[PDB]
Amino acid sequence: TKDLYELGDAPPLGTAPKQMYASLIRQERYGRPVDAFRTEVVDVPPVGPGQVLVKVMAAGVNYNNVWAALGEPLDVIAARQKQGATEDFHIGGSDLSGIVWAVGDGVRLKPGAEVVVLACRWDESAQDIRLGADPVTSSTQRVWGYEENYGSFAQFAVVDEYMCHPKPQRLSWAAASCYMATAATAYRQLFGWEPHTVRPGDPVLIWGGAGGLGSIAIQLVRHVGGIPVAVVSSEERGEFCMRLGAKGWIDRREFDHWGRLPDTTDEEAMKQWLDGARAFGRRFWEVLGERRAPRIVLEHSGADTIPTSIYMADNAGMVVICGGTTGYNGDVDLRFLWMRQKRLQGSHVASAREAREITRLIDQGAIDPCLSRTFGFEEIGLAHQLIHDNQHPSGNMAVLVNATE
Amino acid sequence: TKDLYELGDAPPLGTAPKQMYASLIRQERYGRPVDAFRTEVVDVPPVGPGQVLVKVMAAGVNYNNVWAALGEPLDVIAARQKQGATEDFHIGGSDLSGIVWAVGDGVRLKPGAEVVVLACRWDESAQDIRLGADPVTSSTQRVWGYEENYGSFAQFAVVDEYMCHPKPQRLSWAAASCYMATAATAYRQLFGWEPHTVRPGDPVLIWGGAGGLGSIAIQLVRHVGGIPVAVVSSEERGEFCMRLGAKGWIDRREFDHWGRLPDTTDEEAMKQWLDGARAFGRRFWEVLGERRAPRIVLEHSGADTIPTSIYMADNAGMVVICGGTTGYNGDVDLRFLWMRQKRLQGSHVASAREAREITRLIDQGAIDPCLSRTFGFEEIGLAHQLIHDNQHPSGNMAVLVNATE
Amino acid sequence: TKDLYELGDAPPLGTAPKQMYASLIRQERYGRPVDAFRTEVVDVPPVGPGQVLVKVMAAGVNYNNVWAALGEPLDVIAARQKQGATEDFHIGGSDLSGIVWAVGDGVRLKPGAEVVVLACRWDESAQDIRLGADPVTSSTQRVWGYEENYGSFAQFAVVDEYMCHPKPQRLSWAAASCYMATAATAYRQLFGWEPHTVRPGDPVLIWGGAGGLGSIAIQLVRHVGGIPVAVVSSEERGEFCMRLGAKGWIDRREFDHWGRLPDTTDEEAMKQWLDGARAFGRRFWEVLGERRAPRIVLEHSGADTIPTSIYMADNAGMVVICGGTTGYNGDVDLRFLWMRQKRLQGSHVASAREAREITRLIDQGAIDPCLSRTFGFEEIGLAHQLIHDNQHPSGNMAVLVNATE
Amino acid sequence: TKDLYELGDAPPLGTAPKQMYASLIRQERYGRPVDAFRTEVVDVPPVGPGQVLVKVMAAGVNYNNVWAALGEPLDVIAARQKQGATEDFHIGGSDLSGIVWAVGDGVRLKPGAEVVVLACRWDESAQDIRLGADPVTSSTQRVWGYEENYGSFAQFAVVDEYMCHPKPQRLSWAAASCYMATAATAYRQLFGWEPHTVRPGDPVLIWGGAGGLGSIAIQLVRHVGGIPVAVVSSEERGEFCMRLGAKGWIDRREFDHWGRLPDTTDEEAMKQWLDGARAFGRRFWEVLGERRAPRIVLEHSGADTIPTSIYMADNAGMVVICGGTTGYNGDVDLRFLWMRQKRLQGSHVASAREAREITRLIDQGAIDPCLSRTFGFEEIGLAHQLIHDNQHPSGNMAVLVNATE
Numbered sequence A, B, C, D: 001t002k003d004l005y006e007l008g009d010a011p012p013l014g015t016a017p018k019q020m021y022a023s024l025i026r027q028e029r030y031g032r033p034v035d036a037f038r039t040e041v042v043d044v045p046p047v048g049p050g051q052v053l054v055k056v057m058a059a060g061v062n063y064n065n066v067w068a069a070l071g072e073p074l075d076v077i078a079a080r081q082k083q084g085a086t087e088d089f090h091i092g093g094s095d096l097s098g099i100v101w102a103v104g105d106g107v108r109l110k111p112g113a114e115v116v117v118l119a120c121r122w123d124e125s126a127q128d129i130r131l132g133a134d135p136v137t138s139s140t141q142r143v144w145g146y147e148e149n150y151g152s153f154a155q156f157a158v159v160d161e162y163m164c165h166p167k168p169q170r171l172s173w174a175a176a177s178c179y180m181a182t183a184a185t186a187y188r189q190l191f192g193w194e195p196h197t198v199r200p201g202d203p204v205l206i207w208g209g210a211g212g213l214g215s216i217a218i219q220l221v222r223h224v225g226g227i228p229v230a231v232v233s234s235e236e237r238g239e240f241c242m243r244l245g246a247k248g249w250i251d252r253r254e255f256d257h258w259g260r261l262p263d264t265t266d267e268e269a270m271k272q273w274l275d276g277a278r279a280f281g282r283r284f285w286e287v288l289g290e291r292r293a294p295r296i297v298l299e300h301s302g303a304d305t306i307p308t309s310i311y312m313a314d315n316a317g318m319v320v321i322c323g324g325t326t327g328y329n330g331d332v333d334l335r336f337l338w339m340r341q342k343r344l345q346g347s348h349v350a351s352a353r354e355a356r357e358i359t360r361l362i363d364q365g366a367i368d369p370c371l372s373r374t375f376g377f378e379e380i381g382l383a384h385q386l387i388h389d390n391q392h393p394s395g396n397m398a399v400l401v402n403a404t405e
């Protein structure tokens, strides 16, 4: 009926309001994430066919929104405008839990359904998909809430039907909103790239074990009987990894060989580098209690760590990477790679199927979403300021929207 | 009966001589490959259990022997001595065709059998193999004739039984000896790494198409209905690739972006680099006749070419590499790798199964071993001098031993 | 513009007529296929979104239409009516070549495009598909032209976009229309069920080698270097299989153990049965020239042949079956199946991807569609009468519609 | 030193006695398992190369020994004699836990090592294995203790090195001896046949859930997040399945359609049969709480149950079977199999790798071996008499040999 509802409120189920509250970034306030976000009123986008409107109960936090709020080196608002967009703002957020509130044509999902979203859109009619491509790898794939405007930091969100998954009942709205992009991504890294998937007895090296990705990965690895070794930068983060089921941890502050690889011709430099990697390898042996290499290395740290990751992975093993926190130069020593027949695999979010499987595991209580802290809607900036300053807590964080839980 | 037979001759079938002619490298004559090899008399190693003695009819040529003959940067003779070896020489060669002449205990292979060898040894009792590892990827794997002494540049060779494959009848001894390490390696690159194996309609980028690896790869790709695009450095090498079934070719001399990747932070440098890679990508489009990316990139060229290879491979595609001709720094732009979910796969020689399958294809006449030139036994040095000076002909080369064909 | 065009004619490109000529079955004339089909005028169905209208140039022939024309044991017209259909007729045909003539909304395919169709429809929005199911295996899958009315025996046909594949240029309209369901189905059987796909050196047993399925299968197997052994019921059909690249053939008339398996408790009966299967196995050895079992058995013959097929398949081999010509009781001796760890795989038509790959192979001239005979539009009945009476020629047959080639 | 040691005793570690106590079957006492076994003194077989002598601490029980003790329909003693064996007795047992006591040449395993054995032997030099065959599927594979004499019902046992796996520390000798053939076999059924392996959210139908196979399977399925539905013949067996993590159970006594399939031509019979299978399918829906089919059906029951299993499995699902308790006629309705593209997979024991993985899961406490009852060495007959009379308890049973735990 009405055009605008305050946070926590909604029109009659099955109907959409004309407007809504959402947290916007604008070019004029690019900068500190704490200054970048402001709550405004905006029009609610239309609910086209195959789509549904979700009453957003809580939204997750991530790195993407930090870079969006900075503007550098990519003005996402300006980028979209150069692609035909008329918005002079950006609504971020690429995780949510909520309630289907209205649906478009062709949709089978009924108003009232409780859902968690995988923030990936693709064209279900795309030729590569129709010929057997995994949609998240399709040419038409893009991250909702980051590459596309009108993400989850909004009272309502329009999504495609295939993007929805059943909210695990036992979870709070906040916890149900914090895990999907992080957990699903880790799940794909570990179980999505046959034949290099974690098996019982497999040692796994997990960079940033106390982080969002790593928190889920440690659990996933221990769950199927693998042996998780975590990399941390503090004793407390180490203990947290032990809480999650880690065999043990390695403190990266012990080493100084991190970074780009020298010219493989620079013999002196390489030997010096090798000493660093071997020392790291020793620690790994000491944590594991045996002289084995990780069959799989979970990467995302990128430039500083990739050369070590390549060295560490077992013969016929895999380094699988979904990001580049410390930079995008992945320097590979090809001798390690080809002679031992190792795999460096790029990975990015997850498939619908994988989103569903990890949701089931969490629903059943096998995996914990690791909700570390919940923020209010006016604290979206604060929360992203934490990440930016690398002051965020271990695990995953969330933001209440229409919910009180 | 007798202790020594001249080249072309042999004791009674089923028996081993005490000595033999072979082509040796010695530390005192490390250097120019043409000076490095000399024919000498040496003791014939014992034929232990599981092993067989082969009367060597012809032996193949490769890069390994060139580096062995140079001594730098790895004194293979000194290396082996530090591992307990008593030889003060090195007999190279990692390809042969020949006749089983005597067999050890447990061997089912009968004297008289005509064989081609895959020059890879491993421990059939190794725990990783017994637990399902692919033997060529095992911790106990090593290249016979390069990492191990007493290779194929000898009148007789002792090999393990599992190393033998039926010589294709229709082939000369020279042709049957030239293909295995090269063809089998290319076959594994293209068909050994599911799910990234060449399918009908798949475009494939093949570096060094006119070389040994590339010659086989072009044929293999066209055979299963794929679309081979070759990279060459001359018009004549381009035409040769067309002879083999290539859609077309790209001349690498057209470009100057080759080499290590700049810091991904060096924006100017990267854009300049990207211009180079995009120009290369244009040529590829023009050869293919359509705007598609290679699903698989066959690599081996290494440092100069890997960044381009990474850029070129399709979403969810694979770059598979078995060497580093131009250097061992494989610089990866992680954004290309993770966002498009690409695979960089190390590959090294082949499995027994793969050696057999490519042998069958050649036996049936589907694939040509591309024997380019045959040398006499005293020309082993000359032939390796050619490779060293990059003056060798397209395709694969061989050396007569006991044979006249 | 106009409402009706005679065969061979069409409205302006991009437009649809209101009516068309098509060949109908009606309940009142169920029976002999030669009496069952009659050419009538009918309304042209609407071209909804995602769909396109095709000017049908030629249509393929198959078993399905024979059973449709008989009415027994399934009145397809009555069946559909019980599912809400208002038609009192049935237009069959599940293969066509033709020209896109008009398109619905969301379609990227342009009028003028020449296409071959895979006669399988599914719901691209189905949850099982979205969660990673192969669409042809989906709960919403069905054969266009058989389970659905308005198949290809019509001047125009409405299809879904994903159903279209590029017509191979070098083919006549008749040849381009005859192969898809048959070739694609065989292709899936042989290459669609990893890890049991044909590899170089693999012997393959192919029932009905001179038929449509078998004609393509023999070629596909020989193409990747496998060894095709064909089963036929006549010397001439044997020679035809030799034409296609078969190693040799087996004459099934030599044996009398065909049919359902006796109770495995009936020792006498089973030994008698085993004698039959062993004799068949001997012939297979004699054709192959060695004592090996087929790694893959291409089935479709069904009840009479399945017990033999199960016995014949190699340890860890596969029997893959897409039909039951002689009946639907597939009697398995579980001892053969479990002790040798064999796979009995059901298979049905093909995926879009597989339709495309086999089309590419045919386009490139690696595979011949084996067009055996072409009929005129008024001979649809005659052609199906042949199949019914088992008097049809080897290979695949087609029917001209708007075309003269 | 000495030639014979009483049960519980042994020569100096590293040495073998000339004789030993073992439980023998002899032809003269074929019949009731309780009469068939008698403890005698026998020579200890030699410890050839690659082999090790194990001081047997406990041995597992199974079906095989029951059929061995009956003699019908296969005189295993006479069979072996016709293959050249000189023994006039048979020592059964195909599971053990124990201590490596002496080793042959080439063995790396050291005296003192605690081991569990996978009772499968194969020729590590076999050509099919060397060309990539899974050894348990090899032509040279056979079950130690059943197809071969001198199994585990003996004070000492000679095994091949590859057959040994680390005993899980936390287990009693009895528990460590009872699980391997049963657990490993179930593990292969569920995780060994890609792409049909249990995934999170997968419903799985498990015949005989309270038995040895089923006990492990229920746990394995629930462990990876699947949904186990058990088939039992009593309320108490149902509750036991609930103990193991089952969603629920089905009572097979409710149905009477069990057995061989009628002729698919016998319409009346088939409809009657279908009513039975649909009723079974209803119960499955009611247990699951939703209208889904099992993605995987764990079979072994055989003739009575296979037709139902085939009907039940999901589109593109798998029925995997490792036995035929109720008979060896696996009657398949091919229409269900091909139209829904289902897989009927034979499976038999396990690979070394799989034995190791399930051992790791049990070692870590994720899976319980379900030791139901332990017998003394003179009760081997009694225990097998139970199985024979179908009076054995749920789970797995074991027999003490040299151990008191």
Ligand SMILES: NC(=O)c1ccc[n+]([C@@H]2O[C@H](COP(=O)([O-])OP(=O)(O)OC[C@H]3O[C@@H](n4cnc5c(N)ncnc54)[C@H](OP(=O)(O)O)[C@@H]3O)[C@@H](O)[C@H]2O)c1
Pocket (backbone or CB within 6 Å): A063, A064, A181, A182, A185, A207, A208, A209, A210, A211, A212, A213, A214, A231, A232, A233, A234, A237, A252, A300, A301, A304, A305, A322, A323, A324, A325, A326, A347, A348, A349, A350, A395
């Ligand atoms: N779909 C996708 O592509 C996807 C999905 C999720 C995440 N990601 C990416 O993956 C990365 C991690 O995400 P996240 O959510 O886990 O972030 P997070 O919660 O902050 O965890 C990242 C962890 O990385 C470790 N780290 C930071 N700098 C490092 C260095 N120089 N060397 C080694 N380790 C270092 C830190 O732990 P310690 O200080 O304890 O070592 C940090 O906690 C981000 O770059 C993110 O953008 C991508």
Ligand SMILES: NC(=O)c1ccc[n+]([C@@H]2O[C@H](COP(=O)([O-])OP(=O)(O)OC[C@H]3O[C@@H](n4cnc5c(N)ncnc54)[C@H](OP(=O)(O)O)[C@@H]3O)[C@@H](O)[C@H]2O)c1
Pocket (backbone or CB within 6 Å): B063, B064, B181, B182, B185, B207, B208, B209, B210, B211, B212, B213, B214, B231, B232, B233, B234, B237, B252, B300, B301, B304, B305, B322, B323, B324, B325, B326, B347, B348, B349, B350, B395
């Ligand atoms: N088991 C194994 O690991 C294995 C097996 C076989 C080969 N390999 C390795 O693979 C590499 C190629 O072997 P091959 O036998 O094919 O040697 P080859 O016959 O000499 O072919 C190599 C080709 O690489 C191309 N190339 C050279 N420099 C290049 C550059 N800077 N950029 C781009 N392309 C360049 C050349 O062709 P154009 O000048 O026409 O471009 C050359 O013909 C060698 O490094 C070898 O050691 C490894």
Ligand SMILES: NC(=O)c1ccc[n+]([C@@H]2O[C@H](COP(=O)([O-])OP(=O)(O)OC[C@H]3O[C@@H](n4cnc5c(N)ncnc54)[C@H](OP(=O)(O)O)[C@@H]3O)[C@@H](O)[C@H]2O)c1
Pocket (backbone or CB within 6 Å): C063, C064, C181, C182, C185, C207, C208, C209, C210, C211, C212, C213, C214, C231, C232, C233, C234, C237, C252, C300, C301, C304, C305, C322, C323, C324, C325, C326, C347, C348, C349, C350, C395
């Ligand atoms: N998508 C699908 O599910 C799909 C697709 C294509 C075909 N199919 C089915 O596959 C079957 C074959 O199709 P098709 O197009 O190849 O038909 P086809 O051209 O008639 O070939 C079938 C061949 O089967 C052989 N055959 C007949 N009776 C036999 C018996 N009692 N024992 C052994 N062999 C016998 C015959 O050859 P000989 O007399 O020379 O032995 C006959 O030529 C049909 O039942 C069809 O419905 C299914």
Ligand SMILES: NC(=O)c1ccc[n+]([C@@H]2O[C@H](COP(=O)([O-])OP(=O)(O)OC[C@H]3O[C@@H](n4cnc5c(N)ncnc54)[C@H](OP(=O)(O)O)[C@@H]3O)[C@@H](O)[C@H]2O)c1
Pocket (backbone or CB within 6 Å): D063, D064, D181, D182, D185, D207, D208, D209, D210, D211, D212, D213, D214, D231, D232, D233, D234, D237, D252, D300, D301, D304, D305, D322, D323, D324, D325, D326, D347, D348, D349, D350, D395
């Ligand atoms: N490597 C191998 O090939 C391998 C390994 C292990 C087992 N097996 C075979 O698998 C089968 C089961 O072994 P197991 O150790 O689990 O034996 P088990 O412990 O006795 O369990 C078998 C269960 O099957 C069920 N069953 C019996 N008759 C049935 C019928 N007519 N219909 C449906 N279900 C029935 C029974 O449970 P309810 O009465 O509660 O239904 C019984 O408890 C045996 O035939 C065995 O030889 C083979």
